[PDB]
Design an enzyme around this catalytic site. Sequence first.
Site, PDB file in Angstrom:
ATOM      1  N   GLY B  17       0.827  -1.191   0.000  1.00  0.00           N
ATOM      2  CA  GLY B  17       0.000   0.000   0.000  1.00  0.00           C
ATOM      3  C   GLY B  17       0.860   1.239   0.000  1.00  0.00           C
ATOM      4  CB  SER B  18       0.665   4.351  -1.512  1.00  0.00           C
ATOM      5  OG  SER B  18      -0.722   4.408  -1.780  1.00  0.00           O
ATOM      6  CG  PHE B  21       6.475   9.529   3.953  1.00  0.00           C
ATOM      7  CD1 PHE B  21       5.593   9.188   4.968  1.00  0.00           C
ATOM      8  CD2 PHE B  21       7.738   8.989   3.987  1.00  0.00           C
ATOM      9  CE1 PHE B  21       5.975   8.306   5.994  1.00  0.00           C
ATOM     10  CE2 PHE B  21       8.122   8.116   5.004  1.00  0.00           C
ATOM     11  CZ  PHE B  21       7.241   7.779   6.008  1.00  0.00           C
ATOM     12  N   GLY B  22       5.215   7.526   0.874  1.00  0.00           N
ATOM     13  CA  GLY B  22       5.867   6.428   0.180  1.00  0.00           C
ATOM     14  C   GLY B  22       4.904   5.307  -0.142  1.00  0.00           C
ATOM     15  CB  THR B  23       4.519   2.869  -2.603  1.00  0.00           C
ATOM     16  OG1 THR B  23       3.759   3.969  -3.118  1.00  0.00           O
ATOM     17  CG2 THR B  23       3.774   1.566  -2.873  1.00  0.00           C
ATOM     18  CB  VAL B  24       4.719  -0.179   2.324  1.00  0.00           C
ATOM     19  CG1 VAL B  24       5.240  -1.361   3.095  1.00  0.00           C
ATOM     20  CG2 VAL B  24       5.037   1.036   3.091  1.00  0.00           C
ATOM     21  CE  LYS B  36       6.057   4.142   4.156  1.00  0.00           C
ATOM     22  NZ  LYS B  36       5.346   5.023   5.105  1.00  0.00           N
ATOM     23  CG  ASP B 129       3.600  12.019   9.567  1.00  0.00           C
ATOM     24  OD1 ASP B 129       2.499  12.158   8.997  1.00  0.00           O
ATOM     25  OD2 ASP B 129       4.590  12.729   9.282  1.00  0.00           O
TER      26      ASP B 129
HETATM   27  N1  ANP Z   1       6.711  -1.969   8.925  1.00  0.00           N
HETATM   28  C1  ANP Z   1       5.577  -2.368   8.338  1.00  0.00           C
HETATM   29  N2  ANP Z   1       5.262  -3.686   8.371  1.00  0.00           N
HETATM   30  C2  ANP Z   1       4.129  -4.096   7.792  1.00  0.00           C
HETATM   31  N3  ANP Z   1       3.207  -3.372   7.159  1.00  0.00           N
HETATM   32  C3  ANP Z   1       3.540  -2.070   7.142  1.00  0.00           C
HETATM   33  C4  ANP Z   1       4.677  -1.500   7.692  1.00  0.00           C
HETATM   34  N4  ANP Z   1       4.684  -0.126   7.490  1.00  0.00           N
HETATM   35  C5  ANP Z   1       3.569   0.097   6.834  1.00  0.00           C
HETATM   36  N5  ANP Z   1       2.820  -1.029   6.597  1.00  0.00           N
HETATM   37  C6  ANP Z   1       1.531  -1.121   5.878  1.00  0.00           C
HETATM   38  O1  ANP Z   1       1.698  -0.570   4.589  1.00  0.00           O
HETATM   39  C7  ANP Z   1       0.483   0.077   4.153  1.00  0.00           C
HETATM   40  C8  ANP Z   1       0.766   1.522   3.806  1.00  0.00           C
HETATM   41  O2  ANP Z   1       1.891   2.000   4.566  1.00  0.00           O
HETATM   42  P1  ANP Z   1       2.197   3.536   4.864  1.00  0.00           P
HETATM   43  O3  ANP Z   1       2.955   4.175   3.691  1.00  0.00           O
HETATM   44  O4  ANP Z   1       2.999   3.633   6.103  1.00  0.00           O
HETATM   45  O5  ANP Z   1       0.782   4.300   5.073  1.00  0.00           O
HETATM   46  P2  ANP Z   1       0.269   4.890   6.431  1.00  0.00           P
HETATM   47  O6  ANP Z   1       1.146   4.353   7.509  1.00  0.00           O
HETATM   48  O7  ANP Z   1      -1.202   4.426   6.634  1.00  0.00           O
HETATM   49  N6  ANP Z   1       0.306   6.584   6.421  1.00  0.00           N
HETATM   50  P3  ANP Z   1       1.819   7.230   6.817  1.00  0.00           P
HETATM   51  O8  ANP Z   1       2.519   6.134   7.686  1.00  0.00           O
HETATM   52  O9  ANP Z   1       1.774   8.492   7.724  1.00  0.00           O
HETATM   53  O10 ANP Z   1       2.559   7.596   5.581  1.00  0.00           O
HETATM   54  C9  ANP Z   1      -0.542  -0.140   5.262  1.00  0.00           C
HETATM   55  O11 ANP Z   1      -1.456  -1.193   4.961  1.00  0.00           O
HETATM   56  C10 ANP Z   1       0.337  -0.378   6.496  1.00  0.00           C
HETATM   57  O12 ANP Z   1      -0.413  -1.082   7.484  1.00  0.00           O
END
Ligand code: ANP
Lengths: 310, 274
Positions: B17-18, B21-24, B36, B129
């Site tokens: 997901g995104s 500030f990034g896409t994971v 990310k 954040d």
């Molecule tokens: N370390 C991690 N391990 C597993 N899933 C993660 C991790 N970090 C983020 N995610 C998941 O990745 C998706 C998007 O991540 P993310 O870019 O962090 O969006 P966000 O956390 O909802 N907003 P933000 O963190 O402020 O940018 C979501 O479904 C999260 O639950």
Amino acid sequence: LDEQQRKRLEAFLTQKQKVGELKDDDFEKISELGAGNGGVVFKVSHKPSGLVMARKLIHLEIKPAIRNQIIRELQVLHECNSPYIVGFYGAFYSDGEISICMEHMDGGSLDQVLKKAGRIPEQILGKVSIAVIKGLTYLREKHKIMHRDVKPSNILVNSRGEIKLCDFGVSGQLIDAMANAFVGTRSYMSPERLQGTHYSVQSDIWSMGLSLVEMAVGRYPIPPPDAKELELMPMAIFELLDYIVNEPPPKLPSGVFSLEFQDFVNKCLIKNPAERADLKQLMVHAFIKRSDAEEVDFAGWLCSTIGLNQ
Amino acid sequence: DDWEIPDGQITVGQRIGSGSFGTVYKGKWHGDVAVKMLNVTAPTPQQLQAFKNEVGVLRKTRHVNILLFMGYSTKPQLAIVTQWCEGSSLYHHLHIIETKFEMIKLIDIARQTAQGMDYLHAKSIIHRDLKSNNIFLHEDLTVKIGDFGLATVKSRWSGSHQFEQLSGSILWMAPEVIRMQDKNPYSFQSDVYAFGIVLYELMTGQLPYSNINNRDQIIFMVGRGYLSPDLSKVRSNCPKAMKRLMAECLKKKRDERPLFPQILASIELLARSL
Ligand SMILES: Nc1ncnc2c1ncn2[C@@H]1O[C@H](COP(=O)(O)OP(=O)(O)NP(=O)(O)O)[C@@H](O)[C@H]1O
Ligand SMILES: Nc1ncnc2c1ncn2[C@@H]1O[C@H](COP(=O)(O)OP(=O)(O)NP(=O)(O)O)[C@@H](O)[C@H]1O
Ligand SMILES: Cn1cnc2c(F)c(Nc3ccc(Br)cc3Cl)c(C(=O)NOCCO)cc21
Ligand SMILES: [Mg+2]
Ligand SMILES: [Mg+2]
């Protein structure tokens, strides 16, 4: 109505019947069309019927109860059938994403067209204001649903010269789920909505006005152009909303546009919603009465601007 | 003191997901990590050296309630490598799966969250954040706070100026942070305010401003002080000492809000008291 529209309207219903249940395996991706801060759109081919449609994919993180309500509410769109509303084929959910399947508008949103064109001619904005006034009417009368999101990127146009609205708040629960989006660049939200509530159709009229100005000059008009940027013919999201509320509304340049047009948008951008013009009035404004008589060649101006062959 | 991961080391897998500030992507790297792909694709070498420095400070962070910052890469594109949580984000639990925790466990979630936050502030780290999307429940019990710091990749730099473009989710945002009006709006009390919103989540089962469905309406009214989370919506049996704590973090003027040393203290007091 007329005869070329009653054809095109009935010819859609025929291809729409050829489409039954919409499944994610009946679709073949062709190209990406655009993206926003809550969706991305692909041109796709519906294999069981060969139709080419557009397919918006909204990835929402909502509870399933809310999600299944959204899908249900989105079926009222099978009742929206106007030459001024984008065709709707079906909506469904799969793989964690809501798909909305709408007709392909091969010209794109006016927001793309503005970039390729720089500025848009008043003669064209004339014909555009017409469509947007017809589209918002058909939505207030025949469905009592108000767009609540009129901006250049929700006005779609195609090679047959059609101008159509889309991306309108039919799903009241999607409106609630849209509200946890992050900040955007800019906002076409009328000043009462930033404080109070959707004041019938009048609050959409403001949006159309702001969008006419942005397309007329080629720049989002908040804050208004500098003294010599204008004769050449970045602000924080909060401060824009504070400017929209606590500052006089934008206006057109000066001598560059007619007075009918300058006045038309001035009536649309009145900060009091009740003093602001309503649909009944804009429908017979001078600028609109003239721009309906003009025999402008829109379809040609569009393909020219995109870079194609009439 | 030069933490970078090369190419071909990181097996970038499923697109998760995104965010703001990034896409994971779930990647592999001596075990599952979280990759990310930052949104600052082309980093200016003045921006690029500030990012390097900040990774240094996030690297020396080690706390039970903090996700490990494992360093970054720049090979395909600039990116970030942190621990992979098998848990679900607190957001998912509260507002999607609607997990039915007991009040004892709700308060424990609040305690560990202030526990982690207190370490970050102790090492002079502003989260910037903090939200329930950035809080995972590893093994369904321990709390782990990710996506902290990183001020320089959430600022979209010009050449050498960090003018923080307001981004993130508008809920949780302290009013002074909404306004972006006075230099360093991000502060220890901006985080406390965020934290207070997360208490609102826990104590009510709802996100704030449920009756409002207009993004920009909220931005303006909260920044103007006109809008404030409706604390009426706190559930019947949430401690009195708890609701008062929430209200202190939500103070419109930042200087009236408590810091986490006191906040954590407050939570442990009502913790044993039942
Ligand atoms: N370390 C991690 N391990 C597993 N899933 C993660 C991790 N970090 C983020 N995610 C998941 O990745 C998706 C998007 O991540 P993310 O870019 O962090 O969006 P966000 O956390 O909802 N907003 P933000 O963190 O402020 O940018 C979501 O479904 C999260 O639950
Ligand atoms: N039926 C369509 N035909 C062609 N292009 C389309 C169609 N629907 C959407 N688009 C394009 O997709 C782009 C982005 O989709 P959208 O999710 O509406 O974002 P947006 O409206 O531009 N801005 P936002 O409302 O902030 O997400 C638009 O700018 C259009 O160019
Ligand atoms: C808030 N909200 C309430 N109802 C809505 C709705 F029906 C929408 N879609 C839609 C409607 C009609 C037609 Br024709 C085509 C489409 Cl794609 C959208 C929407 O997609 N906004 O676009 C933002 C970026 O994704 C939003 C709605
Ligand atoms: Mg749109
Ligand atoms: Mg996160």
